[model samples]
Target chain A: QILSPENAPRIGFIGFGAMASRMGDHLKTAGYTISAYTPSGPMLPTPLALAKQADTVVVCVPDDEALAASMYGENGALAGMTKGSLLINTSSVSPEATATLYEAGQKHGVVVLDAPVSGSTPEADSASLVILVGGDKDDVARAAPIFDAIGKLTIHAGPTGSGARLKLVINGIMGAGLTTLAESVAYGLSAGLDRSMLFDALDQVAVISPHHKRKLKAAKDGNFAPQFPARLMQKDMRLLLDAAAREAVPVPTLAAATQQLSLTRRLSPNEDYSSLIRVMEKIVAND
Target chain B: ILSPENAPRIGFIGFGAMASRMGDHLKTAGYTISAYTPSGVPMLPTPLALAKQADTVVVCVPDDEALAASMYGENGALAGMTKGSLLINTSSVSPEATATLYEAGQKHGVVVLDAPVSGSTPEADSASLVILVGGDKDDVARAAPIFDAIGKLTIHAGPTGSGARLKLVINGIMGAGLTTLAESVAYGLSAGLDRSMLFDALDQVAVISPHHKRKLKAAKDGNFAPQFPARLMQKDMRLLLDAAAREAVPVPTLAAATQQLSLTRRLSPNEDYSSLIRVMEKIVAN
Candidate 1:
């Protein structure tokens, strides 16, 4: 009952980026006492200092290395957290990485949940993400209000690391689909199809999902600004492929999609992952 | 006007599965029908004889080769079709091949429309197919009734061959998406995810379209009974790749998707294209 609206738990955030800031905003609006630790500004001082004062600590760093650095060591959040406190890692990291964090949290007498999310910054702003959580059912229930404040739906998947695994699967599927859409449009363009007409036809087709339908305008207008940045998608795809290799899963389609997105490292490292269309256009145009 | 209620003399040049269903719908919709096919019980003797009598000839043959054999010879449909008549190639063939038909039709003073359709037999049976028409603006207008009778929507895509090109682009996109769905599910299962949970999650997600959602049950229950057959999807993918090659377009995503679909040719060649999932299961199972 740590998450009841009537008596909300004190919350601390480590790595306050775009997603973390929005999540902090919603948590504060929902009447929770929340503090954040960022490199430039220390709202509640360091991760260790903030962890000691809060009932629950949310870790949303960029990668597994960042998660490791923030959750371990004497100055880390785990060392300062009290025995019964909650630690939720919402970063999209590998399942193996989440398992290690879970082990470390167990030694600290803490409940750990790998709760990676799916959706863009806009979804974060609207508090409409789909949260995929992996932890004990009791721990998930204890964290309900936090999730309810940040996401539209929360699937308590399984034991720690399941959420990270599921997020990779979802992202792999979405990445492959977006890459295919880009390549198809590029092929149409290379073959002399009118850009507007191709989009017009694509708008009426069954293959395009609602999310992808929104991206058609982005593709049409050559707007490659970051919603879900291409660099982030590149990281997720690599994490997915590495995990697949660990499990010995042959994901040829995802492999091809990953290769396609990998080009964004050089071509549009800061643009949206939908900039895959621009990447494809350049490749097909031999630019 | 080649009216729907008043009707034009509609002749079908191929009586294959999809063509037959579409022809039946058109016939019931008040069009007087004549038909010719090499392997069927032809209501008319040859393509020439049927073309001689009909005002609009519909060609739904399988490939560019079949289109040539049916339309180019002395007994071909083009040889007997009158001036100002319309010839609609509804087959998903090459844009370059459709361009040839446009050139040949110009020689005979006949209008040719490359009007490839998007949908399977179920759609064909219900007259709900999406038609992509490529022809002169006037010819598209003149042939509106026929397209309207057979499809829920007909997009006048552009000039000759554009419809065929756009069809490849659309099919390639859909095929690649389908192949990716299959591989993603296979990867999930291989990584120890529950099959029921995976499908349940997929049903609620934004990555899956309504069209793909129906296929999830099929992929889960293994009911790949030719909604759109694997062989046909392979054929379309081949045509797409061929068109890309002709335009010097590097379609790595589609090429990978095509390679995955090609594997199904050795596995469940006759099942629906969703059988790609079953093939993925086998690959990842190894």
Candidate 2:
């Protein structure tokens, strides 16, 4: 552990979105000092003030751009955080950017860790998320107690930015799985099996993963409602592809998923993913 | 509705690999049975004679081509099957071919149920196949008793051909899912994590399906020994694509799975599907 758990450190969060709201609950219940920098909601006047006010500051923003803005942008927290303070990130973004944020934190004496988590709001409320951690060892140790409070399982993957790498791998499995299932359903419908039978058949089969079990019925009823948004789904695939390219590993399954999901975004950018199945339905018949 | 409870007689046809697995379970249940074996021990003289003796006959052959002979061939059991007897198909084949066989059985007034099962041989030996039934309502109602004996879930999918179609869909998922896991592992390894951590990380995640979880270790050790052959997986994909072509739906992801599996066959034809991961690892990136 980098920092001591002796006296409870004042904890600060950059964003208090759906994920952070639930994540912050455990700390509040544990009697740790809790404060946020949500300009839209409640907290300090800005991100820098939160950094100045707290000893352990964590960013729970959603995208790379917002996560970047929280760090080096105007009134950002990195420069404002005190020397030897611990900084943690808890969002999904590109690994390259995660490293960028790590280096930016290193410029100061602050320690950095990428701690993005999986499991949506349902798990969030119940406090059971799969949290992926990567960065300096001491920095992670400092945040260990807070991690225990918020997650079901916390994996310290490896060096700087590894959390992003693991999350991309995890999301690749999920996105690849969704495409695998939606295409199969397309195959079933085009091939003349009833849609309900198509859904029911795979449901009865014992071999499928939880992702299929969760999403197949959604496809059956044309329910493409975003438990995870398709746009974010595509962005995660993009992150996977970028890392695959940098590492020279060809990702055929993910490529097809990215292609299919890219198609999904255009067909129903705003309407639920009902077009999610219809577009794949045309994909089976199209060239 | 075809056989009586007190003196019910069952005739079996095509004792191939899976046939024997599913067949032995019925024997263990103590149902009166007579059987014709293509290659085995207690064999009836022929499909013709087997059909002549039993009122409720079944053919559990491996091939669509082979399944046709049990019923509509030159000396097919259909000819000798007692009038109004029920003949059931307990193998995977084309929905198109299944309907053709169904049409042929119509001439003899023999009701044909395309009752292909979902479990593999291991599941079969345990008498826990997920049996898919398609045909007459009363015929399915009657076959329900025997279905309960060998399967955990006996779903009456639809018309005569729906069982085969559903089986294709089922295998499509299995084959495609295997490829998905293999490829994800390949993706993980190439992205700089070691294979052990890649599998371990996903292992800890608890999100991948039972299928991916089962194959990950085999994939790690390069154990391609066949539980279910990759050749059959490729065959089912071909059937799936044929159906897709007829229905005018595009199946790009399945096409990738088929193409990947074919590449697997060429590289490790006799090996099990561990080639799924091997081929995925070498996928040419642009």
Candidate 3:
């Protein structure tokens, strides 16, 4: 059956954190009945109850442990999900864990798609997140109405765990790009240039992307407000390095970027990752 | 005095590839010049003679030695330049050298601005270069006509040497950013993704800038034919490392990027800087 807003599928959220809560709101606004599982919210006592109500279970948990904790066991979403139901995971977990979940879904007669999103709370609120999906081609086509409702664009990237693989790739580069910007600005500060002048002149050049360009104001003001928190980036960076090691890829710049990001994770874990500039400044002044 | 038709008199010290293209744009914008300087056109005998007649003397030489050669000594442009004449050096040189030129300008009763630009020959020819000027505010305002005629935007960074310093900052990020992209690409390839698919997915992401995005296709097609030479980037990265060393700044990513670029430079110094991906692929595969 063709899915549409007029006849939307029920969508259940496994982890209702900052990103998933806004995503759940978007699904609700699109006419899909939304159910979420929380430790304190008695309406959905367990992920099993949440999955029983949803035609599609969307997992947005934190890590591999959390994903396994929510998807397996008798009280888990996978055990309770009926045959032919779709499981779309948007978590930034490891690809190997995703492959295990895909195998577990096959046993339950559920089609699991690792569809991690690539935006923050604002993009989720605006329904403009880019979804990178990995699963069967027909299954992805079947989930179009659901994808179209919550994302601006959705790419069907090969078999299970490919989306997770691509997400790590993107996040790895993003972390490195931010560290590069921070390190360069640190160089400018140490080299005796005015801070505002650095931002102003940098805005005119082609070096900074539109994404990092928006971060310049945040960096210039020393405002460490969390859009994408440093802790999550640190998590993603760790995952990326682990993945790179598995693939045997030599990423020198990525390694250097991860080292700097670890400093931000320790210094201001809850603040935005752009606060890495602060640690970079301290490193520059250490000598 | 500020109108386009009655623009300030312009003089050229070195009519090389990038400089001549810039001079052509200035001439097409209606500025009078003795000659285009390098096309075997007989005009002024020395840089000193050229500086005597022009309101602004523009130097776009190759290196610090060439700049010192053109602006120092009795027959140098600085000695012949009259009071109130502007000496705009657009070459990418050391900030210390720019500071020295500014000091020499003070003794010669002239103004020296390290107005280094941010684009290559294509941007210079298209008049789309971004000029980062470092000098007196009033003198920068006076040079507005010349700046407006050539570049799309002019940024007055600060006192002498800021332009050169900022140029290094931009190039430092650029070199590191590109190296990061190359490394990421190699990661994707090693992770079992198709090359074409990896490039398409990267194009959709915000991690790649417009500059690096253009390099992606050339990277995929193995077209490393020198848009911005690896050798130049290698030199700029060296400058950034040297500058940061003097300031006691630790640029880990820049240092790593410089090492990767040095590898690419070893293979083909004159190829495009994006050719580092070739080296990256080999490193990843091994």
DockQ of all candidates, in order?
A: 0.03, 0.02, 0.03
Show the lowest summed lDDT stretch of 10 residues, model 2 chain B: B241-250
Pick by lDDT: which candidate is best?
Answer: 1
True contacts kept of each: 0.05, 0.02, 0.05
- lDDT (Cα, tens digit) per residue for candidate 2, span A1-287: 33333454678899997788888887777666788988575388889888888878878876777887778865999868877777888878888689888888888877788888887666788888888999757667777788878888889899888898899999888777777777777888779887677778898887678656767767667676666666666667656654564443435687577667666665555543334666776667682
Q: What TM-score number comes out for model 2?
A: 0.49
Interface RMSD for all numbered candidates: 9.4, 9.7, 9.4
**Model 3 interface DockQ:** 0.03
Residue-level lDDT of model 1, residues A1-287, one tens digit each, is 56655654578888888899899889889988878876566386677887987778898888887887778899889999988778888999878688888999999999898999988788999999999999889999988989999999999888888899899999998888898899899999999998799988998999888778777778788887788887788778767765664443446778677767776645667888888887777878898
True-structure RMSD for candidate 3:
26.8
The C-alpha stretches of model 3 lying farther than 4 A from their native spots are A5-8, A39-43, A285-287, B1-286
lDDT by residue for model 3 (B1-286), tens: 3334544578888887677778777777777755324234337878888888876788987666677787887778888777766788888887768888999999888888899888876688788989999987987887787788789999999988999999999998889989999989999989989889998889889878888888887787888877678867876776665466445344678767876777777777788888988887887778
Q: What's the distance in Å from true for residue A256, model 1?
A: 0.5
Would you give the TM-score of chain B in model 2?
0.88
Candidate 3 lDDT, A234-254, residue by residue in tens: 778767755563443546787
Of all native A–B interface contacts, model 3 reproduces a fraction of 0.05
Give RMSD to native, each candidate: 25.6, 26.9, 26.8
Question: Residue A16 CA error for candidate 3 (Å)?
Answer: 1.1
Q: Summing lDDT over every window of 10 consecutive residues in candidate 3 chain B, give the lowest-scoring window.
A: B33-42
